[PDB]
């Protein structure tokens, strides 16, 4: 009978329990990791969204970091700014101190110097304060910080350029003008030029001494008491012609010629005042050679003269100033060099509309004695203009021209500006926090959602599938016993 085979089928179902044992193993597999890529995720997209949820928090952890970057930049902005308030308020203090009419002009100059220091510090803070390189107060700019998982989900920080100029205190001045005056300064002594003393021309101007040959022995002796040059002269072939002679010097090319058609040596020899040994033409600095060339190149028309400045305050007290090169009504601060020559002060600066350049220091400003300088169509303080680049950093206020009207109002309006900017930033923080809380709340919630897809087994469900393990194992046990039953049942026939 085919029962052996038909039973084999009934055993194939028992062997199918071995496949159910493969299901026990498959269950053990489903319980092994809890989750398997065996397509329990089909609307993969929908199930992928769970992984996107975690990716959201990944973007949200970076978001929290961002947020904290923003928070820090918020904190930092106010930090660096606090100093600015700290500086300006102090200026206010000087503004009160200034309104005092008992103050002398020297007092006012002193107060102005500290105001200038405070304003300069404000400008440094504005230019250097940074966060990760962002110059938070150097320019108007809105920083967008991604604090959410998706595009455009950001919190914006509106940064403003806060400096002396934007605050309207770039020319805040409390100084008063001094009555400017001068007196001629006939600077003394001589200096040597580039003009080298050419002696070859002497012997032909000294033929009237005769002999065979007339030559100057050594260097010419100059006399800074008379401006006269003298020469030791050896007249080869002559009788009583050797001795000291006064020589005429060509102040242009340096030629040396016997002076005054002298027919015999000076009585008494070389004068006692002729002690300098010169190799070059001496110039009574008095011609202001370089100063005059600088004035011409500058476009200055008038005749120049060296004067000593004087400044008189409101109380009739006068102090002496330095040396100056007066031209017309203008005064150019000057310096007298080693050799007694004089040079107009210059400041040295970069660009304007490209390249290195130079301007001459005039005496002006809010007090009448501040070194100012004209670049382009402007007139800045020399202190500011020194080493400045108008290419890399153009746009600027000239030097203060007069005393500032209503300085306390202006300063108040300035601080008001600083303050409102700070409110936006700090309130930004709290907004960041408020935003962190929205996202944060949804974060705790999203994690509750990934738990459905992010699936796996432990108590409740483990017991369901574990009880099922033993339940099905009971089944495999049933067919383990029932695995031996058939083979024997089939062998009963005799």
Swiss-Prot record:
InterPro entries documented for this protein: Flagellin, Flagellin_C, Flagellin_C_sub2, Flagellin_D3, Flagellin_N, FLIC_barrel
Subcellular location: Secreted; Bacterial flagellum
GO cellular component terms attached to this protein's record: bacterial-type flagellum; extracellular space
Inducing factors: Inhibited in nutrient-poor medium (at protein level).
A Pfam short name: FLIC_barrel
Keyword annotations from UniProtKB, A to Z: Bacterial flagellum, Secreted
GO molecular function terms noted in the UniProt entry: receptor ligand activity; structural molecule activity
Main location: secreted
Top-rank taxon, per record: Bacteria
Note from the entry: Individual Salmonella serotypes usually alternate between the production of 2 antigenic forms of flagella, termed phase 1 and phase 2, each specified by separate structural genes, fliC and fljB.
Function comment: Flagellin is the subunit protein which polymerizes to form the filaments of bacterial flagella.
Similarity comment: family membership: Belongs to the bacterial flagellin family.
The protein's name in its UniProt record: Flagellin
Gene assigned in the entry: fliC
